[PDB]
Amino acid sequence: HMKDYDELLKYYELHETIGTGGFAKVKLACHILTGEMVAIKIMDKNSDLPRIKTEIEALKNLRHQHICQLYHVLETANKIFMVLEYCPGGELFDYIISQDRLSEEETRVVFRQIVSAVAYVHSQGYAHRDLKPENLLFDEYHKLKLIDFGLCAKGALAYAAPELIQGKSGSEADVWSMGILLYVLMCGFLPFDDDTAAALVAKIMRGKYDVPKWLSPSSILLLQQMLQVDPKKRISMKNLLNHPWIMQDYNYPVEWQSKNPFIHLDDDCVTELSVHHRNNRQTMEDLISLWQYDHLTATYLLLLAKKARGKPVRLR
Amino acid sequence: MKDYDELLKYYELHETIGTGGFAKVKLACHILTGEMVAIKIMDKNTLGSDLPRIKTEIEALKNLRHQHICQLYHVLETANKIFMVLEYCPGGELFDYIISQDRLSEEETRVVFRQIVSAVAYVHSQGYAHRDLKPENLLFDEYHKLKLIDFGLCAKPKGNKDCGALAYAAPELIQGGSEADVWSMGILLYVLMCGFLPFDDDTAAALVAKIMRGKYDVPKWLSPSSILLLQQMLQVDPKKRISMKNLLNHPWIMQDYNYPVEWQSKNPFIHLDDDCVTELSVHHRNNRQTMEDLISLWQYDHLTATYLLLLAKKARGKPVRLR
Numbered sequence: 317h318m319k320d321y322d323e324l325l326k327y328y329e330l331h332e333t334i335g336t337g338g339f340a341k342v343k344l345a346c347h348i349l350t351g352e353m354v355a356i357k358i359m360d361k362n363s364d365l366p367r368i369k370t371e372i373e374a375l376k377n378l379r380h381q382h383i384c385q386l387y388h389v390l391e392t393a394n395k396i397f398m399v400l401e402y403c404p405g406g407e408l409f410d411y412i413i414s415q416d417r418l419s420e421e422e423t424r425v426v427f428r429q430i431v432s433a434v435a436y437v438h439s440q441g442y443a444h445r446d447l448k449p450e451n452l453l454f455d456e457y458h459k460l461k462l463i464d465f466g467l468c469a470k471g472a473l474a475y476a477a478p479e480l481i482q483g484k485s486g487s488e489a490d491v492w493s494m495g496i497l498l499y500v501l502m503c504g505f506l507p508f509d510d511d512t513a514a515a516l517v518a519k520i521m522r523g524k525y526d527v528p529k530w531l532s533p534s535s536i537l538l539l540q541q542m543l544q545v546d547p548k549k550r551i552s553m554k555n556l557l558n559h560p561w562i563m564q565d566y567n568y569p570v571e572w573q574s575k576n577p578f579i580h581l582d583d584d585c586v587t588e589l590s591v592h593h594r595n596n597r598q599t600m601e602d603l604i605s606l607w608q609y610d611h612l613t614a615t616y617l618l619l620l621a622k623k624a625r626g627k628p629v630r631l632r
Numbered sequence: 633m634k635d636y637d638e639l640l641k642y643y644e645l646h647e648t649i650g651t652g653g654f655a656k657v658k659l660a661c662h663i664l665t666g667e668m669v670a671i672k673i674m675d676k677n678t679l680g681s682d683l684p685r686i687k688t689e690i691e692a693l694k695n696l697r698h699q700h701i702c703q704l705y706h707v708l709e710t711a712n713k714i715f716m717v718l719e720y721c722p723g724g725e726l727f728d729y730i731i732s733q734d735r736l737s738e739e740e741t742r743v744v745f746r747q748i749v750s751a752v753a754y755v756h757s758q759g760y761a762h763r764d765l766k767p768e769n770l771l772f773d774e775y776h777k778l779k780l781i782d783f784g785l786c787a788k789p790k791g792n793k794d795c796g797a798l799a800y801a802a803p804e805l806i807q808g809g810s811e812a813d814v815w816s817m818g819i820l821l822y823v824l825m826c827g828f829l830p831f832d833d834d835t836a837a838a839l840v841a842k843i844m845r846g847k848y849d850v851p852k853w854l855s856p857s858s859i860l861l862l863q864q865m866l867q868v869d870p871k872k873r874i875s876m877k878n879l880l881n882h883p884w885i886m887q888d889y890n891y892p893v894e895w896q897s898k899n900p901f902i903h904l905d906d907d908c909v910t911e912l913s914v915h916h917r918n919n920r921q922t923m924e925d926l927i928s929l930w931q932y933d934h935l936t937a938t939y940l941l942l943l944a945k946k947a948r949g950k951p952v953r954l955r
């Protein structure tokens with residue numbers, strides 16, 4: 317047997333680890349009924365436990381095309397499992413460091429996905445508080461997914477906002493980190509960087525940085541607005557979404573609004589579930605809208621993704 | 633880029649495999665030798681109370697050199713980053729092997745268990761106890777050999793003062809030696825041959841009670857040789873548990889091999905392989921005498937990195953050459 321893995325292994329076929337981290341691990345798996353690939357964050361529950369519990373609560377309320385999806389939560393004797401969206405494309409961090417620097421046009425394709433995700437987070441009354449390129453992953457279609465909501469509220473020093481260091485705690489800090497991200501994408505180096513943490517802090521607080529020769533005046537202007545030391549003088553989310561730089565080859569503002577619904581349900585997905593549970597229709601729809609994040613939330617959301625990639629609405 | 637400036641002179645960085653907590657493991661390639669490595673990236677200002685678990689592990693690994701222990705090559709430290717350059721183990725956990733199949737035969741378990749015994753007898757000979765033996769902590773290299781990993785809960789039982797999975801934990805360790813490691817090897821032995829733990833429950837309080845009472849199922853498929861080794865290793869009193877010396881040449885261990893476990897290291901601290909020192913002398917452009925004197929330091933810098941990977945490359949049947 318194994319009593320920690322009995323409930324899990326009714327629903328998932330467990331694959332390669334590709335995980336390690338003292339308390340937390342990540343294992344590849346396959347959802348048995350849909351055939352669909354997932355990633356499982358297996359926890360050794362025993363410590364840092366109600367910061368796993370805040371992440372789960374945030375993710376249960378956040379549903380978005382640029383936020384990596386939670387399907388299922390399972391809890392045993394010495395485990396918490398989190399069944400999550402499959403992101404084989406790697407970190408955004410892995411792209412920056414392996415190559416030199418993206419073009420303005422290349423950075424815009426990527427940055428508009430970061431803005432869409434973060435504007436949705438803030439609309440839900442949350443702040444991520446750990447925005448960095450390690451925390452943005454690519455799916456199998458090369459689209460960005462915001463991960464790790466472990467520091468979220470209703471991080472890395474180089475990305476940290478002056479007021480966050482200098483003793484005030486909320487979503488103005490996220491705009492700053494997006495400005496650090498913007499700079500690294502286009503330059504290939506951080507705007508504030510030092511050999512000692514005490515000299516890094518001093519540079520952030522002062523707020524002076526290099527303006528490379530290759531940067532356009534449009535790029536220089538967005539950077540100055542986002543990298544304001546006073547969080548009151550930093551660009552608002554509303555003005556970011558439709559900024560001239562943001563729309564500079566796209567003749568339209570960032571679509572930050574979710575295409576992943578909580579309150580409207582796919583009929584092909586409800587009929588194909590009514591076949592398995594042998595319910596009527598009203599019974600199946602009423603059960604799904606509970607969003608308990610059990611096997612039913614898992615099967616439905618992995619059915620919704622199955623039709624999206626062309627394949628039929630079919631359970632095995 | 634300033635955290636990765638020194639690292640990226642020596643290593644080409646590839647796919648991320650761990651992320652868990654403060655620690656991310658990244659695959660990489662050592663530029664000069666061409667040899668594949670794994671890099672443990674510690675966030676220094678995230679760590680906190682679990683930062684002593686890092687410095688003690690490094691110090692233990694600097695002193696442990698064996699064929700059944702995952703080798704440390706290089707330690708690098710920046711503004712907020714500790715790096716640990718480690719041996720490449722693409723075969724997966726021993727955990728992954730166990731859960732995938734039914735339950736390994738007595739003969740299958742012996743091939744594997746003799747590699748665990750070699751590894752742990754060497755640890756104890758160096759005055760350490762691992763304290764976190766479990767199948768998640770044993771990896772396969774590209775040649776299907778087990779390597780012992782994660783020395784974070786490391787001991788020195790009769791040295792100066794500074795736990796693990798509950799199911800593997802020795803009775804005396806719950807209530808508060810290297811006698812505990814022999815118990816955990818006995819839990820490992822049981823799971824390999826049975827496919828289930830000898831003590832298992834839904835609640836931790838009911839697991840502890842089962843460990844302390846020390847009673848367990850003896851499956852019908854288990855040989856009387858297997859039943860005998862198990863009761864010797866799974867003694868509640870750590871004084872009545874089988875010693876390492878008696879384990880090394882136990883009748884169960886020696887079945888089909890007809891020689892005891894060779895636990896002694898084939899990886900030396902003193903003898904400096906000839907071809908490696910001559911290959912390094914031509915690259916650095918100095919004599920064999922002060923190349924040898926510089927290697928002799930074991931600082932765990934780029935020179936330990938290149939030398940120990942050169943020694944690895946030779947053993948693999950490959951040319952002793954840097955680019």
Ligand SMILES: COc1cc(O)cc(Nc2ccc(C(=O)Nc3ccc4c(c3)C[NH2+]CC4)cc2)c1
Nearest residue numbers: 342355384385400401402403404462463464465
């Ligand atoms: C909300 O999203 C979260 C929250 C959290 O706490 C952690 C994660 N972490 C993930 C990490 C990795 C993956 C993932 O799918 N990675 C993946 C999948 C396949 C392959 C690789 C990585 C790399 N080798 C090729 C195959 C998914 C979530 C998310």
Ligand SMILES: COc1cc(O)cc(Nc2ccc(C(=O)Nc3ccc4c(c3)C[NH2+]CC4)cc2)c1
Nearest residue numbers: 336657670702718719720721722780781782783
């Ligand atoms: C003493 O050794 C240690 C100490 C420690 O604190 C952690 C580790 N962890 C490791 C984890 C993984 C690997 C490793 O090499 N795994 C690996 C390498 C390549 C591939 C895989 C895993 C699986 N995907 C295909 C390719 C090595 C050490 C060790």
